[PDB]
Symmetry: C4
Subunit: 387 residues, 4 copies
C-alpha cells in the first residue's frame, strides 16, 4: 500500500507540473522544482525505456542551464511525458482498494478534462497573444470563461472569432469539448446502472416468486409477508448454501473460516463454553440452521423427539400439558430438546415459537454419535437434563 502512496505523490507532482509548464509564455518556485525532480529521482530508485523516461523527467533542466549560462517552456515537456506510466499506477491502485469500476474512470476524466481546459485556454490566448504583447490574470480568466462555456456546450456567445484562423481553432475546440462532455455522461451512466444491477441480483429470487404470486393473483396479506420473509433471509444471508459456497475454498483456510463460523454461535451456550474444541469443531460441522415462524409448534408434547434445538435468535415458549404454562421463556443462548433426546423419549413438553426463531439443530443421530465420543459432554448436558 505504501508503494501506492508513493504513486499518489508522484501523480500529484506531475499534475502540478503540467499546469506550470504551458504558462511559460506570459525563487521558492525554483526550490519547488528541485523537490519535484528530487521526488522523481526517488521514483527511479523505487524502480529500460521506462528508466529513460523517468530519468528524463527527473533531469533538473532549466535551472541547471540557467546557472550554466521560451526555451524553458519547451524544456517543461520533459516532465510531461512521464504521465504515460499511469497505466501501471492504476493497476496498483485497484489492487490496493478494489472499488466499483467506473469510479476510477471518473477520477481520470476529471483529471484529463482539467488539463484540456487549461491548455485550450492557453491556445486561445496564443492566437490572440499574436494580437498583443503580454497579458495578465484578467485575460487568462477570460480565456477560461470562453473555454469552459464552449466545452460545457453552454455557449453564451459573448466571445467569438473574427479571423478565419480563429474560426478554425474554435471549430477544433468545439469538437473536442463536445466529445469530452459526452464521455463524462458515459461514466455516470455506467456507474449508476451497475449499482442497480448488483441490487437486482440480490432480489432476483424473491422477485421471481412475487411474479408467480402475481400470476396466481394472491392477496397482499400473504405476498407482503413473503417479501418480508425473503428480505430477512437476505439480511442474514442464511438463504445462501454456505456449504457449497465454501466448497470452492482451499480446504485449509476454508476450515479456518469454518472455525470462524463455529466461533459465531459457540460462546452463548454454557455447554460449549465448557466443551473442548474437538467437540465444538465436530459439532459445528454437524449443526444445521433452521428458521421457525411465530406460533410454530416446534415440539409437540407426546411426540417422539429426535433433535436438539439451540436457540441462536428469538423467543420460545416451553409449555407443559396445558399449552399455557410457560415452563421456560427460552431465549438466545438457550437450548431445548435435550430432555427427550438424552432420555430417548417423546417430547414431554410442547414448544412454541414466540417470535421468528433461528435455531441450530442437532439430529439425534449426530447428537448420539458426537456425545458417544464426547461422553464427558454427554455427561454434561445430561446433568442438567434431570430438570
Amino acid at each position: 500500500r505504501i508503494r501506492v502512496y508513493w504513486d499518489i505523490l508522484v501523480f500529484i507532482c506531475i499534475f502540478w507540473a503540467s499546469l506550470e509548464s504551458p504558462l511559460r509564455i506570459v525563487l521558492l518556485l525554483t526550490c519547488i522544482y528541485f523537490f519535484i525532480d528530487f521526488v522523481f529521482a526517488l521514483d527511479i530508485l523505487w524502480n529500460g525505456s521506462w528508466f529513460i523516461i523517468d530519468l528524463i523527467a527527473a533531469l533538473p533542466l532549466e535551472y541547471a542551464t540557467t546557472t550554466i549560462f521560451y526555451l524553458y517552456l519547451l524544456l517543461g515537456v520533459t516532465r510531461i511525458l512521464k504521465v504515460f506510466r499511469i497505466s501501471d499506477i492504476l493497476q496498483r491502485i485497484n489492487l490496493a482498494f478494489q472499488p466499483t469500476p467506473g469510479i476510477l474512470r471518473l477520477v481520470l476524466f476529471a483529471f484529463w478534462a482539467t488539463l484540456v481546459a487549461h491548455w485550450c485556454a492557453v491556445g486561445w490566448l496564443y492566437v490572440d497573444d499574436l494580437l498583443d504583447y503580454q497579458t495578465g490574470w484578467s485575460e487568462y480568466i477570460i480565456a477560461l470563461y470562453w473555454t469552459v462555456a464552449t466545452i460545457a456546450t453552454v455557449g453564451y456567445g459573448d466571445i467569438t472569432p473574427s479571423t478565419d484562423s480563429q474560426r478554425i481553432y474554435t471549430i477544433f475546440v468545439m469538437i473536442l469539448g463536445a466529445g469530452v462532455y459526452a464521455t463524462v455522461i458515459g461514466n455516470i451512466a455506467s456507474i449508476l446502472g451497475s449499482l442497480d444491477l448488483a441490487k437486482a441480483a440480490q432480489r432476483k429470487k424473491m422477485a421471481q416468486v412475487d411474479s408467480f404470486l402475481k400470476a396466481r393473483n394472491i392477496s397482499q396479506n400473504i405476498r407482503r409477508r413473503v417479501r418480508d420473509y425473503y428480505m430477512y433471509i437476505i439480511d442474514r444471508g442464511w438463504g445462501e448454501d454456505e456449504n457449497a459456497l465454501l466448497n470452492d475454498l482451499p480446504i485449509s483456510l476454508r476450515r479456518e473460516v469454518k472455525i470462524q463460523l463455529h466461533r459465531d454461535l459457540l460462546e452463548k451456550v454454557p455447554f460449549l463454553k465448557g466443551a473442548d474444541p474437538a467437540l465444538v469443531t465436530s459439532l459445528v460441522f454437524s449443526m444445521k440452521p433452521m428458521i421457525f415462524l411465530e406460533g410454530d409448534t416446534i415440539f409437540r408434547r407426546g411426540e417422539k423427539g429426535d433433535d436438539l434445538y439451540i436457540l441462536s435468535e428469538g423467543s420460545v415458549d416451553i409449555l407443559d400439558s396445558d399449552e399455557k404454562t410457560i415452563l421456560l421463556s427460552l431465549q438466545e443462548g438457550q437450548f431445548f430438546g435435550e430432555l427427550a433426546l438424552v432420555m430417548d423419549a417423546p417430547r414431554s413438553a410442547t414448544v412454541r415459537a414466540t417470535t421468528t426463531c433461528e435455531i441450530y439443530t442437532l439430529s439425534k443421530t449426530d447428537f448420539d454419535n458426537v456425545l458417544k465420543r464426547f461422553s464427558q459432554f454427554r455427561s454434561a448436558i445430561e446433568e442438567s437434563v434431570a430438570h
Copy 2:
C-alpha cells in the same frame, strides 16, 4: 407506515425552511416557524449526536432572540443541518413501498436541483447586490432566468459577467450546473434500461427457442403459434416449477400458500364442494396441471384409462363411438375420466379438446389411494359414475 408518514411531514418542513432561509438578505410567518419547530420537537419525541442535531433544528431561535432583545439569516442554518438524516428516512421509505431502484433517486435529484438553483440565484444576486441596495421580485426572477438558462446548458447569452469576480462565479456555476444535468440523464438511463431487463428475463426462454427455429428456418405458420404458446404460458405463469419455486418457503406458511392454491381450483367442482378438507389438501397436493391444444384426443375410446381430468379452463367434447355425438360439452368445473377410472376400464368414450384446455390430472394411483382413504368420496363421484 405511519412512522414513514411522519418522515414525509418533516421532510417537507425542512425543504420549505431551506427556501425561506437564504432569502433573508433582501406575523403568520412567525407562527409558521412555531409550527415548524413544534413538529421538529415531536420528531425528537419520535426518536446521541442525532439528538443534538434535532435539538438544534428545533430551537425556536430568531423569534426568541427578538423577544429577548442578517443574524437571522445566519440562524436559519440551524434547521438546514438536520437534512442529513434523509439517509435513514430513505431506508424506511423503501421498506414501506419497495419501488423500482432509481425512482427514489429521481425524486432526490429533483429535490437537490431545486435547492441548488435557488441558492445559486441568490449568490448571483449577492454579487450584484453589491452593485445596489435592495431588490424586488423582478431582480429575483431575472436571477433565476440566468441561473436556469445556465444550468440547463441552454445559455441565451442575455446576461453576462462584467468583472472578473463575476466571471469566476459564473465559471463555478457552469461547472456545477453541467454536472447536475448529467446526473439527471443518469437516472433516466438507468431506470429505463432496468425496466427492459425485467421484460427480457421474462421472454428469455421463448427467445432462445425462437432463435433455434430461425436457425432451422422454420416457417411462420409454426413459429408464430410457438411464440403464442409461450406467451399464454407466461400470462398464466404455469410454466414455472411451482413446486421447486415454493420449496424455498418456510414449510409452515408454504403450506398455507399451498392451501391458497388449493383454494384457487377447489370451488367449481361439486365433488370438492362436498368434500372434506383433508381430502382437498391431500388431493390438491396430488393434482397436476396439464395443457391440451385444440383438437387433442385427450381420451381415446377403447384405450385403458388411468387418470381423472378436472377441467379448470377450456371446452371439451365428450364423444361416443362415432366421434360426433357430443355426449357432453364439458366446461370449466367439469371433470372427466371418472367412468373408466372408477370402473377400472378402458375409456368407453373419446374426448377431444375443443379449445386450449387447462386440466388438473389425477393419476389412477393417486385417485385410488386418495379415495381408498376417502371411501365416502369414492362413493360420491361413483354415484354419478353410473351415467
Copy 3:
C-alpha cells in the same frame, strides 16, 4: 391485425385534430371533420366510461352548433381527451408485431414531443398576441424557431423575454424542454444497449473458452480456429440441445415441429424418398447430428463398424486399402457405413472427411431395431450394399 390497422387510422386522426385545435386563436376542412367523427363513430361500433369518452370525441360539435346558431377552440378539446386509450392500443400493437422494447417508446416520444413543441409555440404567441391583434405564418414560424431552439438546448439568444411574465413562461419552457431531450437520450441508450446484450448472450460460451485459452496463453494458430468452430456452430444452432429445448413444448405440436425437423434432412436420401413415414419418424427421432473436421478418419478400414453416417453437409473420401483410391467422393445426400453395418462386419474401407462434415449417425442398435421392424427397408439399402 385488422383491429390494429383500425387503431392506426384512429391514432392518426387524433394527432391531426390535436394540431388543428390550438390553432383556433388566429369548407373542405369542415368535411374533413365530418370524416374524423365518422371514423370515431365507427370506433364506438368497434367497441362504460370509455364509451362516454369515445362518444364525446365523436360528437360533431362546432359545425352542429354553427348550423344551430374562441368557443370552437374550446370545443376542440372534445377530440383530445380520447388520446388516453393509447394505453390499450399499444398493447395490441406489440401483440401484433412484437418488436424490440424501446422502439415503440421512441415512436411515442416523437409523437409527444411534436405536440409539445406545437402547443408551446402557441403559448409563446399567446403571450405576445397580447402585444398585437392577429398574426400570420411568419409569426408562427418565429415562434417555432424560438421554441425548438430552446427545447433542443441550443439557444441562439436571438429572442428573449422583456417582461417578467415572459421570463416566467420561458423558465417553464426551459425546464420542460430540457427534460424531453433527456428522455430522448434515454431511449437511444436503452435500445442500443439491449441490442448488444442479445449478441453477448450468443457469444457467452465461446468467450468463456477464449478467456481460458488466453489464461493458458495458447497460440493464435488454435484460438482463431476455436473461435471459428464456435462461430460456425452458432450459425447452424447445432450446439443447442435441440431435445431439451423442445422438451418444454406441448408434445402434440412438439412432435409436429419434430416432423418439420424430420422434413429438414429427409428428402436428399433416396432410401428415405422410398421409405414409409412411420420409419422416417422413428428414424428421425433416432438420428444424431455429428460434426467432423477436415481430415478426420471417420472410418478406419479393418475396424469394427457400428453406425451409419448420413452426410447432410460436406465432402467425404471413401478410400480402399491404399488410402488414396477414392472409391467414392461422397457428398450431401449420400450415406456410408451401410456395408459394414448390414454385413455385421469391420469397415472394409477407410473414410476420411474432406471438409467439415455434418453427419447424422445411426447406431447399429437403432439401425437393427429400426430395420428389423422395417425389414422391407432393411431389404432396400441391403440391395445397394452389394456394392
Copy 4:
C-alpha cells in the same frame, strides 16, 4: 483478410468522392478520378443489382462527356449510391477482426456525422448563395462554423436567419443535429457499460462469497486474503472446470488442445523429458492440478502416501524427522511423493509448502496403472527413488 483490405480502399475512395461531389457549385484531380473509377472497376472484378450499382459508380462520366462535347455536380451522385454495400463490408470486417460491439458503430457515426456536417454547410451556403454569385474559403469556413456550432448544441448566436426560408432550414438542421449528438452518446454509453459487464462476470463468484462474509461480519484479516485467493485463481484461470469446458470441443482438435496443455507442464520434469509421448499423453490426461497455501503440511512423515506431487509452481520444504532439516528445497520442475509411492510406503519425510504451490497430482492408482504399462518409466524414477 486481403478481401477486407480491398474493402478499406474502396470505402476510403467513396468517402473522398462524397466530399468532392457537393462542392461542384462554387488536371491531377481528373487523373485522381480515373484512379477512383479504376479501383471501382477492380471491385467489379472482385465481385445482379449490385453489379449494376458498382457498374454505375465505376462509369467514367463527366470527363468522358467533357471530351465528347452543374451537370457534373449531378453526375457526381453516381459514385455516392454505391455506399449502400457497406452493410456487407461491415460483416467482413467483423469477421476479420472481431472487436467489441459498438466500436464499429462509433466509427460509422464519425463517418456519417462528418458527411452530414459537410452537406449541411453546403445547403446553408446554397440558401445564402442565392444572396450572391460565387464564394471562397472564408464563406465555406463560416458555413461550417455555424453548422458545427448548431449541431454540437453549443449555439453562439453569431449567425441567424433573416428570412422565413432560412428559419425553416435552420429548424430542420437543429432537429437533425440534435439527434446525431444523442446517438453519439448512445454508443459511448453502450460500449463503456458492456466493458463493465465483462469484468463483473469475472468477479461474480468471489463477489457472492464476499457478500456472504459481510453478512457473517467476518474480519478483514480473512476477507482480504479470500479475495486475493480468488484473484490469483482468476489470474491463472485454474478455477475453471477445464474438463467440462473442453468437453464441448470436437474431440479431434480438443485432444490437440489437450496436447498443448500437456505441453504446458511437460518440459521441466526430466522424467518426462525422457518419457515417451504415449505416456505423456496418458499421464497428462490423468494429472490433477492442486493448490496449496503457505505452511501446508502436504506430506506428513509416517502417514501412508498415495499420490505424486509434481511442482509446477512454488517452493516446498522436504523435511526429515525434526521438521527443520530441509532435505530439499523443492522448486518448479521438481517432484515428490515418489519415494513412498514406489516403495508402497508411508511418507518417510514431511513436506511443507513454503509458498503458495501449484502441484499436479498423480494418485497411486493412476501412477501404478500408468507405470505398470510404462514399466521402463517405472524403472526410470525408481532409479532416482533410491535417494
